[PDB]
Amino acid sequence: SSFSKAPQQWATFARVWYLLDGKMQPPGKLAAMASVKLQGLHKPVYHQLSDCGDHVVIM
Amino acid sequence: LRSRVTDRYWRVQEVLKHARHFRGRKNRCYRLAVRAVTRAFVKCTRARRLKKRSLRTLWINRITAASQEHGLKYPAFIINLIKCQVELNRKVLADLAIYEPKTFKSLAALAKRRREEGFAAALGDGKEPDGIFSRVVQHR
Amino acid sequence: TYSSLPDDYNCKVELALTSDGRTIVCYHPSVDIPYEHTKPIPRPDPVHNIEETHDLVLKTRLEEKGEHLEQGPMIEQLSKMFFTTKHRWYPRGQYHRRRRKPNPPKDR
Amino acid sequence: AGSQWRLQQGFAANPSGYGPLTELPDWSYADGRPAPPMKG
Amino acid sequence: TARGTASRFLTSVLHNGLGRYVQQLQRLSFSLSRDAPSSRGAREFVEREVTDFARRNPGVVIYVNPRPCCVPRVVAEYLNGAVREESIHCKSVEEIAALVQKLADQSGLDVIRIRKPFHTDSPSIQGQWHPFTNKPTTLGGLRPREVQ
Amino acid sequence: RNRIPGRQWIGKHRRPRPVSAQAKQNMIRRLETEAENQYWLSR
Amino acid sequence: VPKTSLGSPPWPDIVLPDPVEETRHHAEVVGQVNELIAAGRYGRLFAVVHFAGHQWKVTAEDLILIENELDVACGERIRLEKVLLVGADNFTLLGKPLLGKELVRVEATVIEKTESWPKINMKFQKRKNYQRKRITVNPQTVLRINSIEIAPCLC
Amino acid sequence: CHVARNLAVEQLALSAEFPVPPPVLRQTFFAVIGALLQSSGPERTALFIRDFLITQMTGKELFEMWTITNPMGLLVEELKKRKISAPESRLTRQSGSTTALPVYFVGLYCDRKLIAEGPGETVLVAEEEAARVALRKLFGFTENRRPWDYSKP
Amino acid sequence: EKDIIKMLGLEKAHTPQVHKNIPSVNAKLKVVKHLIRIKPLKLPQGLPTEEDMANTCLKSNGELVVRWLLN
Numbered sequence: 011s012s013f014s015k016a017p018q019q020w021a022t023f024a025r026v027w028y029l030l031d032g033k034m035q036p037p038g039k040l041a042a043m044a045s046v047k048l049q050g051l052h053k054p055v056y057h058q059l060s061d062c063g064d065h066v067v068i069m
Numbered sequence: 070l071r072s073r074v075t076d077r078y079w080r081v082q083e084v085l086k087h088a089r090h091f092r093g094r095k096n097r098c099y100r101l102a103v104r105a106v107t108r109a110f111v112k113c114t115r116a117r118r119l120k121k122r123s124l125r126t127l128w129i130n131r132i133t134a135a136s137q138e139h140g141l142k143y144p145a146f147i148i149n150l151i152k153c154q155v156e157l158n159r160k161v162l163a164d165l166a167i168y169e170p171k172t173f174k175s176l177a178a179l180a181k182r183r184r185e186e187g188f189a190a191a192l193g194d195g196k197e198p199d200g201i202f203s204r205v206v207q208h209r
Numbered sequence: 210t211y212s213s214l215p216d217d218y219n220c221k222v223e224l225a226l227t228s229d230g231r232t233i234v235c236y237h238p239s240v241d242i243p244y245e246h247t248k249p250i251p252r253p254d255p256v257h258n259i260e261e262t263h264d265l266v267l268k269t270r271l272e273e274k275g276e277h278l279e280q281g282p283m284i285e286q287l288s289k290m291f292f293t294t295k296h297r298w299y300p301r302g303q304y305h306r307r308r309r310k311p312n313p314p315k316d317r
Numbered sequence: 318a319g320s321q322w323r324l325q326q327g328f329a330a331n332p333s334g335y336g337p338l339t340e341l342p343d344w345s346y347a348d349g350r351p352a353p354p355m356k357g
Numbered sequence: 358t359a360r361g362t363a364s365r366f367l368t369s370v371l372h373n374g375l376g377r378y379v380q381q382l383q384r385l386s387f388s389l390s391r392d393a394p395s396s397r398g399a400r401e402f403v404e405r406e407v408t409d410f411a412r413r414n415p416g417v418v419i420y421v422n423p424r425p426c427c428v429p430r431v432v433a434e435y436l437n438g439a440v441r442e443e444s445i446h447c448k449s450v451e452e453i454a455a456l457v458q459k460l461a462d463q464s465g466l467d468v469i470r471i472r473k474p475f476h477t478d479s480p481s482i483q484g485q486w487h488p489f490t491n492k493p494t495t496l497g498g499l500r501p502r503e504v505q
Numbered sequence: 506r507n508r509i510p511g512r513q514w515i516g517k518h519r520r521p522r523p524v525s526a527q528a529k530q531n532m533i534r535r536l537e538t539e540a541e542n543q544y545w546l547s548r
Numbered sequence: 549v550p551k552t553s554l555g556s557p558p559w560p561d562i563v564l565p566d567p568v569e570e571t572r573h574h575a576e577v578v579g580q581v582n583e584l585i586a587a588g589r590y591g592r593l594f595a596v597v598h599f600a601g602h603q604w605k606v607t608a609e610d611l612i613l614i615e616n617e618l619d620v621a622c623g624e625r626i627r628l629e630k631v632l633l634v635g636a637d638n639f640t641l642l643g644k645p646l647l648g649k650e651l652v653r654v655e656a657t658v659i660e661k662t663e664s665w666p667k668i669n670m671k672f673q674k675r676k677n678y679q680r681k682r683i684t685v686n687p688q689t690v691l692r693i694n695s696i697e698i699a700p701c702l703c
Numbered sequence: 704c705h706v707a708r709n710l711a712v713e714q715l716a717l718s719a720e721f722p723v724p725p726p727v728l729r730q731t732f733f734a735v736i737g738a739l740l741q742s743s744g745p746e747r748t749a750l751f752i753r754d755f756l757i758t759q760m761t762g763k764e765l766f767e768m769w770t771i772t773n774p775m776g777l778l779v780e781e782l783k784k785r786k787i788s789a790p791e792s793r794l795t796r797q798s799g800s801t802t803a804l805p806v807y808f809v810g811l812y813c814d815r816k817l818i819a820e821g822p823g824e825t826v827l828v829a830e831e832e833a834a835r836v837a838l839r840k841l842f843g844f845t846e847n848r849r850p851w852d853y854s855k856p
Numbered sequence: 857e858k859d860i861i862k863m864l865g866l867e868k869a870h871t872p873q874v875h876k877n878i879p880s881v882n883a884k885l886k887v888v889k890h891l892i893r894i895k896p897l898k899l900p901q902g903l904p905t906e907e908d909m910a911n912t913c914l915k916s917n918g919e920l921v922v923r924w925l926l927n
């Protein structure tokens with residue numbers, strides 16, 4: 011809980027890679043969570059002016 | 070008696086002091102500055118009105134994010150937090166969501182427990198079982 | 210041992226009610242990641258530029274890496290490296306760089 | 318939201334409506350003398 | 358306009374009011390006249406209220422200057438180094454007293470737009486959110502498609 | 506490609522905008538409220 | 549009992565603790581939190597507090613700005629009682645919808661009574677020659693919150 | 704110098720060269736401290752020092768005035784004084800190793816127990832930050848620590 | 857309908873107003889009954905006395921509590 015300012019900010023705004031399987035899956039229900047993770051709308055630190063956003067790899 | 074306006078420099082300067090940061094000829098030409106300052110002030114008031122709505126939408130997005138991170142939906146979380154007579158607004162709920170992970174996890178656990186309790190009381194079809202978090206506390 | 214949320218992450222939450230009835234309390238200490246769920250530190254240290262003939266030339270060979278590249282290839286290289294579009298990396302005008310605040314406000 | 322549930326439980330639709338969050342005087346002096354009341 | 362003017366955060370200088378309260382106003386200098394009719398409220402404020410104001414606030418220094426001036430002014434200087442001009446031209450005595458009390462109750466910082474209505478140092482009690490604070494660990498710390 | 510002739514909400518040919526279930530439940534709620542009102546206005 | 553995709557509901561079955569054992573477990577957790585609050589093992593407390601029509605997340609040694617004028621002199625110390633939430637790293641007390649006055653005492657000193665920056669309110673309507681411009685100067689109060697104290701009484 | 708400037712010791716100081724050079728300003732401020740010592744009791748000067756100097760660390764952490772450069776070694780010495788033998792760095796959480804923004808979490812384990820965990824861009828920086836977290840928790844300077852007692856005994 | 861809403865004292869929305877049960881009031885309420893909500897006034901503690909005029913409260917289920925927030 012006690013970190014310095016720069017590594018605390020780096021941990022808060024860290025970018026995360028997600029994995030997603032597309033076998034026997036509807037593209038709309040895939041793209042709903044793909045859009046959410048590309049926004050970073052799963053982050054409580056989300057802001058539209060910030061560069062928050064996560065990578066998604068779909069196989 | 071001929072009368073002329075002498076402080077016209079200050080008359081144009083009271084308009085031009087609000088338009089120094091504009092692009093084009095609106096920061097210099099007084100005819101173009103007045104229409105630009107007027108629309109700027111009108112947009113300032115209207116965006117001041119929309120600021121509360123935009124910040125509320127941001128808070129709802131943040132609460133939805135931090136509640137779906139625990140696997141509980143936003144409307145279920147809100148109504149089951151209200152059903153425990155905990156009245157925290159969405160601003161401070163997003164504030165707990167950002168800076169307070171264990172406390173927001175406890176709140177989400179309380180909301181999930183209240184949701185399961187309400188579903189159990191609905192499927193029971195009886196008034197005799199009253200839960201530990203379904204009891205209603207009156208004012209004192 | 211009952212909990213509405215799993216205790217695998219964040220805090221081990223224990224909810225309770227005051228017997229009088231107007232207070233909800235909860236005990237939530239951290240859960241620590243145990244030794245078995247971690248991996249050891251990757252150790253990488255190898256010097257292939259060292260020469261048996263001349264270490265003073267070998268140390269300069271490790272400082273001999275330099276390259277110059279044009280603007281367009283530099284922009285697409287930066288875009289591929291940092292996973293952004295190419296339109297951010299282009300510079301800006303005098304009017305845009307002059308209206309940036311020289312002393313921005315700072316909190317904390 | 319949840320005004321309907323508060324309506325069956327007897328509270329107001331709005332939490333600002335006549336609750337113990339509302340008619341208590343939100344500040345008081347540290348030594349314990351009462352505050353002057355609210356105009357509202 | 359927020360985009361037109363400058364902005365500052367909500368800041369108490371020298372962490373005022375934390376250990377003790379220090380009235381950050383230093384001095385007032387009134388510039389008034391004995392002859393001009395616009396200095397009437399300043400003259401009556403000098404006659405009645407200035408001595409009582411000095412008894413109520415022992416930490417401020419009050420100077421009164423009757424000089425041949427047309428516009429009566431009061432200049433307030435603070436501990437921060439801030440100087441603030443105010444025109445007391447042609448006002449009633451209760452208006453002058455309200456203006457002096459409002460200048461006395463201020464801290465002295467620049468009156469511009471405040472970005473946020475709160476200030477906090479160390480807001481990260483019991484941690485701060487990072488994307489790994491709620492994600493469970495895999496046995497061995499494994500990646501989803503990495504085999505051991 | 507396909508046009509509404511004239512203005513949308515005036516003419517002989519209008520926009521074929523349908524009724525929604527939310528509007529339906531709003532109407533039944535308003536009917537229940539006024540039915541309670543005309544019960545309380547009876548005696 | 550055949551297995552049908554809609555024959556079973558599409559949500560996992562939930563089981564609930566027995567009420568008397570939940571009561572004893574709640575008493576045990578309340579006693580543990582009371583032992584902790586009596587031993588004083590809490591580091592730094594935060595509190596969600598209701599004041600002047602708003603709810604603020606407030607930690608000690610901090611500042612809040614109130615948008616309305618208060619009839620309190622500068623440098624006076626006041627007590628707030630509408631504490632909706634209090635907490636620290638190990639524990640968190642919820643109100644329903646309020647906490648007791650004998651449970652938590654939270655205290656703030658008035659720093660500053662000032663006026664806000666001049667805000668502009670103008671309404672303009674097109675080609676009817678309607679323009680209204682006005683300047684709003686709002687009285688404001690800067691408060692420094694000093695201490696958050698919890699008495700060890702808890703049932 | 705900031706405390707003296709905001710309290711306007713430089714306004715009451717009698718010296719040449721108006722900006723009051725910082726050793727001279729420090730000399731004048733501690734002369735005011737000594738004048739308060741010969742004026743009132745030592746507990747009053749202690750209260751004044753607590754009011755006007757300990758309030759200057761609000762929001763500050765330990766390691767931007769201590770400025771130690773080897774947290775690992777000093778953590779080893781402090782663990783020897785506390786009679787715990789050897790810390791071990793273990794990579795707990797990571798996101799990206801071939802990308803331009805690598806993120807690593809490094810935890811410190813003594814007898815297979817977690818005492819600290821730290822973030823970093825590089826594994827070495829994360830290990831140093833984990834040592835900083837461990838040293839901060841050992842010494843009692845935390846974000847979670849008790850705030851200063853400003854009261855009247 | 858505007859005029860009847862005006863003379864019934866119902867200018868401000870979402871604010872209750874107490875009226876008699878008489879047919880004279882009931883005819884106007886019949887005319888504007890699609891714009892309003894009517895509840896009975898319930899008195900569980902009876903009519904308030906002159907000592908308790910300032911201490912009444914109106915609970916939105918439709919009742920008038922004579923003693924509100926004692927001590």
Ligand SMILES: [Mg+2]
Pocket residue numbers: none
């Ligand atoms: Mg409004």
Ligand SMILES: [Mg+2]
Pocket residue numbers: none
């Ligand atoms: Mg009003």
Ligand SMILES: [Mg+2]
Pocket residue numbers: 509510511512513514515516517518519
């Ligand atoms: Mg048409």
Ligand SMILES: [Mg+2]
Pocket residue numbers: 509510511512513
């Ligand atoms: Mg058309």
